[PDB]
């Protein structure tokens, strides 16, 4: 539910980024009070106690009362502001409505200022992280409304500016707090054994859904950088729990093997370029004690993964001996949105075996409404069984449609935890907003993270993301191209686009873009951080190249690079954006 | 003092219900800051520590600081708002006064929103109940001012509505919280012995004075339901402490007898129709040890009680043997407002006897300024003595007049706690606002609770009140009349009145009224709750019958009924109101 | 730093008292957010933990979170208000800027009301004293801005008055809280030995710098009493730590002697009239153990001190035998702003000796830019050494100039703690704002405390200050003159001035002033307190004598007196002010 709501909120903000036209602010605001201040329950205390249970450290009974009391009162005010904001909809002229809405806006904007430190208490920053992050986003949307149509509210140009300036610094402040405190929180649960890793990974996945995916949208509220509609991609991989037992007491981590440090390096893919799974091939082994107690469980797999117009990559995990047949499932261009998995446990004299004898992959074709299940199993009986529904961990956002139209995540990679007499698959997922084609729209600002590329230049490493960008990030230490991406355009192609790239660098440099590997458009831009400085939100600037360009084909490719600086300096690239000039 | 203030506040709100004309809001508001934010002391912490001592459970030193700090700051703001509200009195046109008063109104209305959860902390809801309830009333009066003359403030029709809507839902929210939490609080002090019953009853009486009597006036703030002046009656019975010893260690509850469960069923009258005492007859027994240590104490009484135009009822308690003479006092139509009682204790070898050898009943005639004492005693000497002044528990409201003009309660019933060698009278009182004649005014809305009736139909039970109505309530389970009341009208009788009755029902039904048991005016009205649902504030609606009527005599009688529904459903009636049409 | 900031703030308010013209409010406000809400650190928690360490009693981890969270949010709002206040600078006409600035002013003024009890928690009033006092001043400056130019904001005359009234009562409320709680705090650290006295004196000096010097400026915010520029003097003496050891464990207080009660009476000058040091003569004694371990340390001194046009006074402390030579330093009319002192420790078999073998007095001439050091030493080697820089305790205010132009305090008196084999000088200092000439300006209101006089009448005692005036105070118990002062005027002398004197009295009386001991101007004024009442902020009123006068000479003398009342009553005088009539 905690996770369910963070998905609904973050996924619905994706639709209302930059400048919205007409009346999606009010319906979004209306949706927002319904999800955040509902009848019946308090989702804030659900946030607070969700993280508290994760890190296994309860807030003081004090800090509890203070924040939630501040939160509901703020919700009475947020409900009041939107209520009247929902009446300004029809209003064109009134010296009283724009005078009360005036005051309740200003009061609540002010109210969020005082309230923000309340959810930011020393020694209990981490338990309040989701509570804090969801509140921080709320304040940043309201400052966006100052720029949006406060100009009609009865606000002066100077006060709009004063409002925009705090939105800028609050975007920097809120994006830093969440990143560091998500990191510190994650840091403390670093353990020494597997049981601590499950708690570690759980903290990572759940808070990535609520907090980090919201923070990554904060830059896209800026009215001046995104003066129209803009589109964003969240590119991080998240890992659902490994499919193993949990009851009655060996389980799956006390069934021998590996260490915390071993599991973390074995399942977490190092920072890569984003790929979609293609063909999956499962190998099985049979482990019986008699005619009534056997099960052929999951021992190894071979998964093909392709970047966007990439050459095929195939990884191998586990065992591959094929006395038993191997079953192969087909995932290419099909969104595996829901996996129902069964964790089997067979027992010998003292030694129990954990494996997976059944896993169904529900898939949808995002381009043309084709569904399907893909089943793996051989046979089993007399063994223990524990279900793993992916939607327990990765629910579709709450919609008026079924799950195969409303899902929020795809299967992207299957790793495998192996040991002596233990097999625990781990599904890594990628967010829906990260698309398969890098489609470039004609009437909105398309953000394409450089992580959506297919090829790295001979010196470009993908380094792990700071927290507040939505995914990992690419870093050159000397001049040259960064990565090679492929982009697709819609019906009418005559469109000219200017290029703008979110970068972080130690030096003034020349940033360029080449289309179809032939014609080039460059610019000169500024240093954004100090040499030993540790990459915060303000280290990132936008480098707008003046000159517009036409794409030659509906399927063209775009390179991003930066040279003309002395090596040893560090240059980062998060994202190239394409601004349709019109 | 805690109790003294709850009386002053609640009693003074009685005069300013519905729509006030001219300038009683400001003087009431001025009175309100004087009583709530005085110089010298903090009555909020007096509230808080009064309940804390009752339930014998102190708030955390934390929750203490938070709420009182919020409260005084709110009082600095409430003092500021009223200060300028007290200057708008003279103002007719000003774009600045109605612009500051504008802002400090809106700010404080908003301020109460955030503040309300502060006085509503989990695990300490009951100790803050009076603190909470008095604050809740404060917020609800200000929302009433939005409807009242915010229309002149510079408020638009839509924002007045938005203000009225929160007044509606806050009236529902605040009336539910107080009722349930008064009930939960009362529930925990349910004990097993008599010493726990005194603490139990003390909690009941004191919090009924401050909280419940205030909540019962919350419906009467609605500007649309009561668009003029309206009159309200509080009909509950409250029970002062039984007159027994308290020092040096047997006292009156360790002098043997009964249990908690025994006392509660023996003294608390089950839900009845309200009656006023008539003739009281005391019986006494003499208990001496010698010539220097005797006392004839109170052993039994016989009290006559009449409903409004009711047949005489006489109850009997205790002993009645009349070797000693019996003394009879006359209370008919006389408001016993003050009782000074003496708890006597005589001692034998080990067995002590508790009784009352002296009790004076100060009375006033509410129609024509006749006072008087009525004394009971026989003779006593050498025995212990402990005074019981009713005004210690039931003080008159703070006025510029003496107690026999400013009293807030009347004696209504005398029960008696009996045991082996123990006599402890208990005085039950009814609030002043509940009148003796059910007078119906020509220019205000007269609320007559159905508990002010004289006769029940053959299936109507008086069930115990939910908490937020002011008294108990009447319930039919099949169609027919509810109860039979008698009403009185003032000088000019030509007036036509329409009837409107606060009801709660499971089904659509026909609600009617008949005047003088002859002519009938009915209507059809809506279901208001679900079958198993537990009767909250929103279960109660108003059923307005369209047709006006003339009363035939200055002393007429009015029946309330509801038929045309299937039995097994439940129908409740709290109150019939009479709206003078003009 | 805590002390460093209290100096900067208080010293910079001295320049912007009463009514400022043009644009020093905004630059002062800009300075104020920089010093109070800086980047990097939280000076509020530095305040809070500074006092906490002094009294050796930490706030609860709770009260901590609450106040600082309220404080920064208030700082986000204070930064916002000043930000737009810093834009109204250029604005002359706008129905929107004066409408947002409108609302954020009113909101923050309201915000300070609720916030003030937050920093005033029961059982932790003293640790929050500096936090509280600095916040109290902030609120009082904003109320001053209501009177100043709220009249242009869009405020009505009546609301300005309502704003001024709270400024009056808040000036009374904040000045009382700080004085009593500074006193209670100081009271608890009353000890029995010398180690407790150092902690006692430390609490006195540090909180006098931050809190008391700020409170003494609160009266000078009143727009009606000081309708122009006004000048104020802070006249209290503060005492830096006695120069003794602190490491490795005898130190200087365990090296035998005296008690708490002995030290307090020996070093703290009883309430006197303010004097400036003149000629200082140090006597030394030699204490060696061999040729490699000797030191001639400070044993006694003889200091000349003169009031303003006073006869010379000379005090003597310590020893005076002159086998060793005596060194004499010249301080007359020279501001000893910085002293660097060395605490020496020589050791015998078990008995160690503490003395001072080196002390340099940096001085500046305030009239004409002459600097200089004045050194005392004889010779020392092989002994322990611990430096005492006065700016560790008494820093110059943070400026763009060096310390000999920006210092905040002068050396005024040197007392000496003596014992058997122990010498610990103690420097008493007077604040810079207290001047040497009592200069009277032509275009500002000059406050001259009566403590700046030179002669007391035959019945006038200087009694210790209540806390909220800036220094001690003079009290007559029968009619007559109070004290005799000398005043100096600037270039053009034609000016007429009216006299007004801050007094506190039990009776209606005649207060007079005589110039040059010849011509007299008197008036009749009102009782201000009750006979046994204990002198609070409201005990002090201003007695304005109607008639203007001319001073005859550039160096004239002014007497203040009050007769025509019955003896036994008490009459206090803090300050005579001189209002240039024009």
Residue numbers in the entry:
A (entry chain A), B (entry chain A), C (entry chain A): 54 to 301, 307 to 640
Sentences reproduced from the published study:
Two new modified Bacillus thuringiensis (Bt) proteins, Cry1Da_7 and Cry1B.868, with activity against fall armyworms (FAW), Spodoptera frugiperda (J.E. Smith), were evaluated for their potential to bind new insect receptors compared to proteins currently deployed as plant-incorporated protectants (PIPs) in row crops. Results from resistant insect bioassays, disabled insecticidal protein (DIP) bioassays, and cell-based assays using insect cells expressing individual receptors demonstrate that receptor utilizations of the newly modified Cry1Da_7 and Cry1B.868 proteins are distinct from each other and from those of commercially available Bt proteins such as Cry1F, Cry1A.105, Cry2Ab, and Vip3A. Accordingly, these two proteins target different insect proteins in FAW midgut cells and when pyramided together should provide durability in the field against this economically important pest. Taken together, these results support the conclusion that Cry1Da_7 and Cry1B.868 are effective insecticidal proteins against FAW that have the same pore-forming mode of action as other three-domain Bt proteins but bind to different receptors, suggesting that they would control resistance and increase product durability.
Cry1B.868 was developed using chimeragenesis, similar to the method used to develop the Cry1A.105 protein, a familiar protein that has been deployed commercially as Bt maize protected against FAW. Cry1B.868 exerted mortality and developmental delay on FAW (and other lepidopteran insects [not shown]) at concentrations between 100 and 34,500 ng/cm2. Its MIC50 of 430 ng/cm2 against FAW using gradient-purified protein suggested an 8-fold improvement in specific activity toward this insect compared to the parental Cry1Be2 protein. There was no detectable difference in insect responses between the Cry1Fa-SS and Cry1Fa-RR colonies for both Cry1Da_7 and Cry1B.868, suggesting that the Cry1F-resistant colony was not cross-resistant to either Cry1Da_7 or Cry1B.868. Cry1B.868 was also highly toxic to the FAW colonies, with LC50 values of 262 ng/cm2 against the Vip3A-SS colony and 43 ng/cm2 against the Vip3A-RR colony, indicating a lack of cross-resistance. Interestingly, the Vip3A-resistant colony was significantly more sensitive to Cry1B.868 than the Vip3A-susceptible colony was; the data suggest that this difference is unrelated to the Vip3A resistance allele, and it is likely due to slight genetic background differences between the susceptible and resistant colonies. Cry1B.868 at 50 μg/ml elicited robust membrane permeabilization in Sf9 cells expressing Sf.ABCb1, while only a background signal was observed when this receptor was not expressed. These results indicate that SfABCb1 and Cry1B.868 are a functional receptor-toxin pair.
